[PDB]
Symmetry: C2
Subunit: 393 residues, 2 copies
């Protein structure tokens, strides 16, 4: 009881993003140890404790905050769109978990449209399923369907003419006059409701048969590309260009912070289909600036792509605990991983102390300085916390 007394530490934290249908509801959980055992308190962004809301928000045993299923008219912003957090506290101090973003989605409007595409014979074609920005978080392309129905799904066989890219576009090798008679519909899936539906629009291709030579041209919006992909996932890099004769596509990666570039090596992991680079099992080193060089006899063109491979954020403090004599300095170092890293910030007993560096330093330790210390690592998506304790010697 008195032996091995510790400040609190989180065993289990909720994930950064909690997104759920009003029909599904949600449950988040928080666990922490310590001696004495800490009390768990669900808090709001302003630091105040959240209470029960009938039929909407419920605090239960085992430190679980529950959001039951609810009618559309029952939607409440103060409940269903909010950032929560877990507060663990005992006599030695307080720690706050990473931000928990709770968003309930009441089932609503969405639909996909497919832009028609004029393509020169022999060139590759790309059909895109365009999804509204406000549903794009929960809605992505599952597959494609031709006029006969035949279902086209993503795969590792790149040898076929029809290929669904990791990003969801339908890629078609070496178009020909027959392809003009085919029409395609994209099937999208809502990850919250598990619902799937076909686009009302049918993607078409108009195949042009030029005699006179046409030089490579990239539409201005395709000239620069910015792609974000999760670590270990699969992804593709488009180079959108048409020419007669059909052009060649060469992919290079710039050496960071220089104008020099090296050709991208094709292997089991990295494949190239026409102008498209297809990469499975993303790695941290893939991140960087890429260049696609397009050439035919009459002219040439280029596409610049900035790739960012995101990795989950994690944080740790060295030491997890230390005992410092009065008057002597105390230093805390926040070790973190994940990509990208925007900020690093420090906290003491649930209060931001206004220090932005991985190293927190207390010049002269006093009574008031003892307690729990945290560092938070954040980016536009994820947050991660680490905790440590300062004791007086």
């Amino acid at each position: 009881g008195g032996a091995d007394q510790k400040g609190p530490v989180f065993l289990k934290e909720p994930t950064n993003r909690i997104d759920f249908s009003n029909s599904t509801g949600a449950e988040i959980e928080c666990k922490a140890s310590g001696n004495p055992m800490p009390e768990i308190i669900w808090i709001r962004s302003d630091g105040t404790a959240v209470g029960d809301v009938p039929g909407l928000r419920q605090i239960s045993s085992d430190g679980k905050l529950v959001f039951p299923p609810f009618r559309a008219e029952d939607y409440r912003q103060e409940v269903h769109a909010q950032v929560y957090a877990c507060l663990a506290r005992n006599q030695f101090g307080s720690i706050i978990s990473r931000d928990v973003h709770v968003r309930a989605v009441v089932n609503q409007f969405y639909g996909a449209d497919i832009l028609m595409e004029y393509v020169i014979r022999g060139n590759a074609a790309v059909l895109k399923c365009s999804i509204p920005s406000f549903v794009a978080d929960f809605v992505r392309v599952e597959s494609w369907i031709d006029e006969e129905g035949t279902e086209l799904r993503p795969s590792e066989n790149y040898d076929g003419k029809y290929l669904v890219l990791p990003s969801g576009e339908l890629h078609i090798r070496e178009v020909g006059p027959e392809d003009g008679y085919k029409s395609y519909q994209c099937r999208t899936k809502h990850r919250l409701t598990g619902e799937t539906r076909l686009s009302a629009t049918k993607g078409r291709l108009v195949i042009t048969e030029p005699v006179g030579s046409v030089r490579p041209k990239v539409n201005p919006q395709d000239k620069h590309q910015f792609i974000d992909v999760e670590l270990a996932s699969s992804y593709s890099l488009l180079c959108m260009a048409q020419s007669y004769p059909t052009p060649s596509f060469r992919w290079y990666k710039f050496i960071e912070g220089t104008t020099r570039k090296q050709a991208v090596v094709l292997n089991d992991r990295v494949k190239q289909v026409s102008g498209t680079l297809i990469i499975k099992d993303a790695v941290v080193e893939d991140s960087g600036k890429y260049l696609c060089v397009v050439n035919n006899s009459v002219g040439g063109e280029s596409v610049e792509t900035v790739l960012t491979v995101t990795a989950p954020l994690s944080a740790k403090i060295d030491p997890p605990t230390q005992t410092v004599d009065f008057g002597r300095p105390a230093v805390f170092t926040c070790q973190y991983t994940g990509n990208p890293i925007k900020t690093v910030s420090w906290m003491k007993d649930g209060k931001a102390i206004g220090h932005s560096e991985p190293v927190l330093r207390i010049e002269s330790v006093k009574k008031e300085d003892k307690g729990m210390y945290q560092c938070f690592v954040r980016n536009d998506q994820e947050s991660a916390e680490a905790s440590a304790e300062l004791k007086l010697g």
Copy 2:
């Protein structure tokens, strides 16, 4: 009574033309005696006649008659030409002329259906195939009743046609659902005006809960290039419930600082769209659109680049220097950007890049015509001067 050649009329940097229309480039130069005009390639070699394809007119213009698509020849129809003018006193070459013939090709405009949250502005775009993209643009938009929407200086209305050709729509309500919009494009080579068979539609949605401002990944970064004196627009494509506020800033170069954009007669803002007329080179820079509502935020980066036509001049236009005394040439030029400066003597590159060229001692060999050339990845310009002997 005696003069070296100088160009009165030079061809433009770019000549684009349809195989149906053909094209004609003109070069005129003044000198005593009258200089002969010779057409050459980029490599400096003389161009010959190709029957039905490349010809010289009665007044000495290089002619590209209309031709069958099967008669397309790259050496003729994709080429960089130049005009060489000379007399007994020397030679001068005009700026590069990029000649590109374009065989008429089938094309059409499609319009993506736009889902819009009630109260938000909407932007409809006329999507054009890449191979006609340089030669085809939107001159207007037409609703279901045939009412023509033209770009205007009145920004207070419901509809606004932006310089880039998009149809901007203020504060979309569900009452706008029944309407349709078609773009009327213009082919500058063939002069053909045509109406899109596709009809742009707005689908209006009313969200149950609040919505954070959201920008599609491809709209997060934007890049705009515009010529001097020309009007343009900077889009911030974002939607939120309730409707958001749009704040435009401009970064101070080489810093994280930013200054808010100053709206005036020249610079006006419609919803989240920044619209500017009479572009100036100073407008060039990196901009930031910040979007806000009660429930969240979002941003859009835009790199703007304004270019100016290249022009060149040499001071003095002509000079006579005694044997042994130095001669000085200074190249005055304008336009943006300037990538390279190169000089020339009597049609031959002398390998000097500076705005100033000075001979320390004039010899009888130094007698002749001198030129300086300003260049970038698109445009080129020249200036000529004569040197005599005293």
